[PDB]
Every structure is written in C-alpha cells, then in structure tokens.
Paper text:
The outer membrane (OM) of Gram-negative bacteria is a protective barrier generated by lipopolysaccharide (LPS), a complex glycolipid that makes up the outer leaflet of the OM. Following its synthesis and transport from the inner membrane, LPS is inserted into the OM by LptDE, an OM protein complex essential for most Gram-negative bacteria. Several copies of LptA link LptBCFG to LptDE in the OM, forming a protein bridge spanning the periplasmic space that functions as an ATP hydrolysis-driven conveyor belt for LPS molecules. Once they arrive at the LptDE complex, the LPS molecules are inserted into the outer leaflet of the OM via a process for which the details are not clear, but which must involve a separation of the first (S1) and last (S26) β-strands of the LptD barrel at the front of the complex to allow the translocating LPS molecule to move laterally into the OM from the lumen of the LptDE complex.
To investigate the SE mechanism, we also determined the cryo-EM structure of the complex of SfLptDE with the SE lipoprotein Rtp45 of phage Rtp, which is related to Oekolampad. This structure shows that Rtp45 binds to closed LptDE at the periplasmic OM interface and causes conformational changes in LptD extracellular loops (EL) 4 and 5 that would abolish RBP binding. The small lipoprotein (~6 kDa) is bound to the periplasmic, left-hand side of LptDE close to β-strands 5-8. PISA analysis shows that the LptD–Rtp45 interface has an area of almost 1,000 Å2 (CSS = 1.00). A β-sheet is present between Rtp45 residues 30 to 35 and LptD residues 318 to 323 at the base of strand β6. In addition, Rtp45 forms two hydrogen bonds with LptE on one side and two hydrogen bonds with LptM on the other, meaning it is sandwiched between both lipoproteins. Only the first ~10 residues of LptM are visible in this map, similar to other LptDEM structures. Besides a disulfide bond between Cys30 and Cys38, Rtp45 has a long, partially β-stranded hairpin that protrudes upward through the LptD lumen. The main consequence of Rtp45 binding is that EL4 of LptD is displaced toward the extracellular side by up to 20 Å (for the Tyr347 Cα atom). Thus, the conformational changes in LptD that block binding of the phage RBP result from physical displacement of extracellular loops by the SE protein, and not from long-range allostery as in FhuA.
Residue numbers in the entry:
A (entry chain A): 25 to 43, 51 to 59, 66 to 92, 102 to 784
B (entry chain B): 19 to 169
C (entry chain C): 20A, 21 to 30
D (entry chain D): 23 to 75
The structure:
Amino acid sequence: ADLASQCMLGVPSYDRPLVPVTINADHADAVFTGSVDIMQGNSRLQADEVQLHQKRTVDALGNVHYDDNQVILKGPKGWANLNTKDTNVWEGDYQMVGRQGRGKADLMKQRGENRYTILDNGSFTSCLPGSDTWSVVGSEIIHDREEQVAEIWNARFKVGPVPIFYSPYLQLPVGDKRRSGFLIPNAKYTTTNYFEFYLPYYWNIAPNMDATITPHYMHRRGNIMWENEFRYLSQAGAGLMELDYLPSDKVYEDEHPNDDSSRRWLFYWNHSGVMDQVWRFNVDYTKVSDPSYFNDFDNKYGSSTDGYATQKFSVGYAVQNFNATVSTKQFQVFSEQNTSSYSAEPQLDVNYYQNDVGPFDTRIYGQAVHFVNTRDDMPEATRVHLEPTINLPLSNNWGSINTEAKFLATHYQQTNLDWYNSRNTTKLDESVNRVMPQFKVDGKMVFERDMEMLAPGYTQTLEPRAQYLYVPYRDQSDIYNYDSSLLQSDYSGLFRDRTYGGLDRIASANQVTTGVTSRIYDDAAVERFNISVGQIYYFTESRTGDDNITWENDDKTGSLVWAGDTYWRISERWGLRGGIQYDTRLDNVATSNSSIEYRRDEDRLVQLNYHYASPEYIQATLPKYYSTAEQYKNGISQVGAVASRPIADRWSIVGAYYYDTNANKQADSMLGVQYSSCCYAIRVGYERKLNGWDNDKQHAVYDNAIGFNIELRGLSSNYGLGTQEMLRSNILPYQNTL
Amino acid sequence: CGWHLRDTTQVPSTMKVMILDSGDPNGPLSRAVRNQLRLNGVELLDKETTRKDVPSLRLGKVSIAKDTASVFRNGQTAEYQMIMTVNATVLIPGRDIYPISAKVFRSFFDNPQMALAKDNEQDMIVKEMYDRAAEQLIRKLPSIRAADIRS
Amino acid sequence: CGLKGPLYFPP
Amino acid sequence: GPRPDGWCATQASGVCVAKWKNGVVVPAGEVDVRYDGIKGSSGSVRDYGSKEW
Ligand SMILES: *C[C@@H](COC(=O)CCCCCCCCCCCCCCC)OC(=O)CCCCCCCCCCCCCCC
Ligand SMILES: *C(=O)CCCCCCCCCCCCCCC
C-alpha cells in the first residue's frame, strides 16, 4: 500500500499477451453493426457501427474504444486504415497503458508503427483520474514512445483552471531517458544571507558528457552567481569541473573597498579513473579568488573558521608486482593565523613485490620528494628514501606467527636555512643521513567454545594477539618536520609500526603490544557480537629527537595506551557500536564514541550517538592556539539524535538534534517534512547551526535557514519520499551505522 | 573452561582453491584481498583457467566517504568520519551466487596548520581500511558454506 | 523540464 | 584484438564502463557523480548510483 502501489491503482494495464483482421459482429463495402471487435496485431477496435471500403479501411461510428499495448482511446467518431497502421479518433480522451499519463483532445492520431500520438487542441496531465491538479493543455501535442517526450506547441501550463504560464514551445520528459531542460528550483531564506533562489538548467551534450548552468540570485549581494558544472566520461576516466562566478559583490565592496573589482569565483576539478587496468589518473583541485570566499558562500559569520583548499594531481602505473606514481600536492590555508604551508612538487613512489623467495617475502619502497614553502624564508629540502623488507610467515589452523625485518635509509639536502638558523638554537644541517633498521614479531591464536548453555547452536571465539617492535634511536632535531603528524591509536592502531604519518619523524620503539578479541557466531555461522581490548607496554621511552608534545604526566615507560571496540548486531534492525581510547600521559580518556540505531527500512530509523574528545587531547595534538581559545579548548562532548517516520505513507517527518553537554547549548537542529503525491511533491526544511564565534562578546552565533522545494511527479519512475536526502541536509549528516 | 583450540581453518574446505575475479586486478583492494587469501592458504587460480568446478570471488564496487562527525564551539569541524563499503559475490559453481559486504569506520582529526602532514595521515587511514575490509570478506565465507548446505 | 541521469559510452 | 575478453578497458569511479568483448571494446557500465558542495574550504562530489551492466 506504498506510494508506488497507490499511484499504480488507477493506471490501466494490458491483458492480452504480447505477440489477422478477425471481425466479430451480430449483423455482417460490407457494413457491420451491433457490436464489433477488430484484432490486427496487439491492437483492438471496439464500436457499434463499422463498415469497410476495401479497394482495406474501416470507419467506426459511435462509442469507439481503441485499445493497444501503449494507449487507450475513446470517442464518438473513428477512422482507420488496416495497412498504414493509423487511427483517427475525434474529441474524447486518451490514457497511457502501463504508465500514468492521460488527457483529452479533439483529434487524436496514431501514426507509423504505432509510435506517434498526434494531438490537436489537447491536454496532457500526469495525475490519476479525478484529480486535475495540473495540466499542460496546448495547441498541438506529440507523444513518441522511442525518444519518450511530449512536445507541445503554444503550451499554457495550468495549475487547476489558471494558466500560470505560457510558452511557444515546451517538452516534457515522459520516461527515463536524459533530456535537456529545467530542473528542480529551490527557494531559501537564511538569517545571515537572506532570500536566495536557484534556477538549474540541464544540457545533454552527448551520451558521455553534460552541463548544468544554475543562476543563483542572492538578495543581499544584489547580483547573480553562475554555478556551472561540466561532467565528462572519457577513456581515461570520469570527472567534473565546477566554475562558480559572481561578477560583482555589493557586500564584499563594503568589507574591502580598496579593491578595484569585487568579483568572486571558485574552480573545482575532480577526476578519477583507470585506463587499460594499468594507468591510474586522479585529480582533486580547488582554487578560489580570495581567502574570504569560503566564509561568505557558506553562511559563515566571521573570518574565524580555519580550513584549506587541496590541489592534488597524480599519474600512476600499476602492475601485479610493481607500481610507480608521480604526484604534486599543494594547499592554500585560510586561517587568520600563519598561513604558510609546504607542498610536494613533485613526489615519486615506487613499489616492488616479489613473493616466494624461499620461505620469505620481499618488498621494496622508494620515494623522492621536493618540499617548497609559500614564504621565501622557510627552508626547502629534497628527500630520498629506500625501505627493503623481508617476511617469514608461518601459520596453521589455530595460530600464526610472522617475523619481519626492515631497513630504513633516508637522505636530506636542505637549503634556505639562513633565516631559521639565525633565530633558533637547534641548527638545521645541510645534509642529513638517517639509516636505521627495524625488527617486528607478530603472533596470534584462536580458540573456540560451544556456548550451548545460553543459546542453542552458537559458538564463541577468543583471539589473543601479541606483538614486539624494536626501532633504534636516531637524533632527528636537525631535520625540519615537513609532513609528519602524530597518529591516533584505535584498537587496530595499537599494532601499527609507526607513530607519525610521514618520513620526517620516526620515533624509536621498544614495546610489546597485547590484545584480545571475542566474537560470537550464531547457528548460521553469522557473526553477531565482538569486543576487543588492547594495550601497549613501553620498555623504554619513545624518543623522536624533537620531543615537543605537551603531555600532562611525566610518564615514559609502562602501560600507557589502551583501546577498545564493540559491535553488537542484535537483529536485522538493531545495531550497537562503541570505542574508547585511554592514554595515561593525558590522565584522562583521549577519545570515545558510541552509537545505537534501529532501522526497519529506508523511511523508518532512529539513531542515538555520542562523541567525546578530552581537553587534554586537544592540547597535546592541536596547535598552541587551540589550547587557549574559548571555542577550541573545551574539547568535544555532544549527544546526537536522528529520527524519521512516515505517516499515511505519503508524508515523511525527519528530525535531528545535536547537543554539546559541556556548554549546555545545542550545535545543530533540523526538521524536514515532505509530502509525496502521485503528480507532485513538496519539501520544507529548517536548520539552526553554528556559523562562527563572536570575539567581542565571547559566545557563538547561529544561522537559521528555512527552504522550500517543489517537483513534478509521474513523468519518471520515481516514488520516493525523500527521507534519505533530508537526512543529509545538515552540517552533521546522517551516516548509516547499522 | 570448555574452550579448545580451533580445529577448522577459516576458509571452508570447499574454497581452498578459488578464482579471484576483479575488474581492477592491480588495485589496492584486490592486492589486500589477494594478500589475505595467501595467509589462509587459498591457492588462487587465473580467470582463464580450464577449471569450471571451483568457486569464484568476484570483487565489486568500493566507495569511500568522508563527512563531519562533531564540531567545535564556533561551528568548525573537529573530526571526520570516514566509511568504506565493499561489495562482492561468491559464485559456487552450479548452486547459486552469495553476495557479501564489508563496512569499515574510521575517525580523523583535522589540523589546518599541518596540511601536508594530514594528507599523508589520511592516505595511511585509507590504506589500512583496505586491510580491514579485506578481512571482513574472508570471515563471511564460512557463512556462505553453511548457507550452501541448507539450500 | 529535463531529466538528469548517468553517463555512458556511446554505442 | 590485443587484449582478451572481459579486460576492463576503462574503469571510472569504481566501476568498469568499458570491456573487451571479442577484439573490440563495448560499453559495460555507467557513472553518475555530481557536485555536492563545499566541505569547509574545498569541493566535493557525491555518487548518485554507478553500476555495471
Ligand atoms: C520543469 C521543472 C522546472 O521548471 C520550472 O518550473 C522552472 C521555471 C521554468 C521557466 C523559467 C523561466 C525562463 C524561461 C525562458 C523562456 C521563456 C519564454 C517566454 C515566452 C513568452 O518543473 C519543476 O520541477 C517544478 C514544478 C513547477 C512548479 C510551478 C509552480 C507551482 C505552484 C503555482 C501556484 C501559483 C503560482 C502563480 C505564479 C504566477
Ligand atoms: C525544461 O527544463 C524546459 C522545457 C524545454 C526547454 C526548451 C524550450 C525553452 C523554453 C521552455 C519554457 C520554460 C518552461 C518549462 C515548463 C515549466
């Protein structure tokens, strides 16, 4: 009894089988009368007065009912030719078979191979009979089943009996094939940027490319921003280009009156593909005119939110035992603080794998990179890395132990050190060589037990795991930190062999990692539950030479890191997740999160989640400005709730609410309602979100927003209630965690 | 203590010789899956082999999404929730096809002052997710063997 | 009125 | 025809959109990715359904 079934109830269906002139009359230029039935192919003609002329043509008079596998005709006068496959039916009505279109006319013609439906002074509507919500009555209408369109001449769009629109020419996409025309328009009011309006226009260039021009009129700025999109599908992959361009900004001229022009633009290019299974091309490029572009056209209040734009290219060549890649990675920082950043121009990655060298496995990894800074005072360097590896994996049914040896060799050539050295104590070096091995031992076991006491046919496992990592200590204070950052340690991250992501900081390690996992499988060998607990024991302090992390305790050795996980799959609808991260040097819980969700189907779902991040974790990792600002220093502690429920199978209510318990103030709040019908659909949305910080008053500012969509239905095979598109319409979008 | 050492291998005895079928055989996911099957002891076969009596694991679409998870007190995003979804089907020769899936969740704290360093950290997160999703696909093989027996 | 849809290679 | 049957001549956005049939390349997929919006200070894309035929 869903919307697809309700709108299909009034739709006629074809009963005869899908595959010749058999007449059937009571009284048989032969004239027939009473009640006739003419079957030629899949077509049928019904009337009470049909006569032949031969030479074979028929003339029907009175209560003519033409039937087909595509249309249905009714009228008081008819005429057809049994050789040209044409029918002329006078004033009456028609209705599509197997779909929703219908309307009336004065002269309806069927044409070549029953493909055209020529209409004179007719109308076309997509609603079910007895609704008459909207119609597109025009002078002439042409329906064709191949291109799936309805061309209308001298069209007058009507809502009810009111001709709200007039146009010389118009096309409606009656089907699923792509066609160029106007898409769904949007209306929106915001407490920051005021009234807005979008008018998309599609363009079907070719089967493998299309464009979309979207004039976006913002009232506050007094000009239209042209949002352009171009999608393509070539032999090298598929991508798209975005070019938004605002010729003049009246708000920007007030903030920055010294600039000659106030134009605003943004260019985004994204590409991703693989050609011939070897070549791998990737692009992710973003460029904007001014640093305040992302604040203005995101409904942001002030220039306080940090961020950057990523401008990456890549070309690769992958084989089963080798892959080489060249890539340049640049960024553009948009903070009020220092905006200097490094970029790799270019970077080369080479890998080579050769298995079965006896009982061992072999691997080689090389890299050659060049670092440049936007400023002309910061150092720049060239780095070359080599990393041969050797394994020895042994395994059986109940356990497996793997022993790995590795060697690390890096070379540096640093220049532009005059400014940095002249005002710092630890001088940098022109040439640095950093060679150091690595030895790791990993082990696992698995046990099983038949837990018939609790449930019949279930089984439970227990998988203890241990590891030992040893890396020697090399002083790295004379190497600038270009692309190394501290890594997070979830349960599976306890067994990682790196602390920093990059090659400029490689901390010494002398530690043993221990963990355990316990899974529960049901009688169908389907896993339902699993929980993991792990830790790291440091035998000696992990030193990276620099050693400039702001810890809370002066703890160096012992059990310092803990982590855990949980995933319970109660039923097909329920699902619970968890995770905690404890660090003794923080004397607190670093990070934690949880989530419980019920989801009967797409429309019906409830979800509760939690996110935590301690004040000490913000201090240890994020910059020194995040430990003193009132909008950063408290960490994260928020509770979220997402829900959805449809009523009467046409409505759909959606809500969301996120609440920061530290400040006792909300962070996000959403509420969307969409009424889906057989020939239209209306959506309304609301959202209150944080959009900046007021330094003068020391409290956050919010940004309200209420939208309004409208859409035509029945032309395409779409009957969704729009729940999944409303759930992702807020700054903290819904994510399926089932 | 009713425990005992596991006496059965993770890969069912009927899938000890399998055909790895993928549209991107040189990609990161196919390498991760092929690495897991080596550890368990599976003797992978070429697609163009003469054998028509061995199951085939066809690897499908892989999607990675990154979204905001929680925000600071000024609306700026604090952590990103990254999700990877992998689809695959196992074609038992003659019986049926059994679709399977794997979903991996990760978290990522951004730091605009270290933008080059966070891109290498983010590249490390995605590489590790291919290994987690490659393990979940292997753990769904014993359920396929038991479903095959029932049908 | 138009209909946005997926791309494909020409036949 | 150089490459054998089923060889994915072009893979786009995680799905194969062209494969060799017998000495010739034929389309075997579709791609539907659209511009999503600004993710802080950058662009993004969203997959509205890409499949293999
Ligand atoms: C087809 C799609 C989107 O199409 C649109 O509705 C967008 C507007 C179309 C026209 C744009 C104007 C530019 C055209 C240039 C050529 C003009 C030639 C003129 C020659 C003389 O349909 C949809 O998806 C949206 C549904 C349409 C809703 C229409 C309003 C419904 C409610 C009406 C209530 C009364 C309004 C009274 C208005 C006067
Ligand atoms: C749909 O996107 C536009 C209809 C076909 C475009 C070609 C003719 C341009 C003028 C059309 C008039 C706009 C009104 C469209 C129907 C509401």
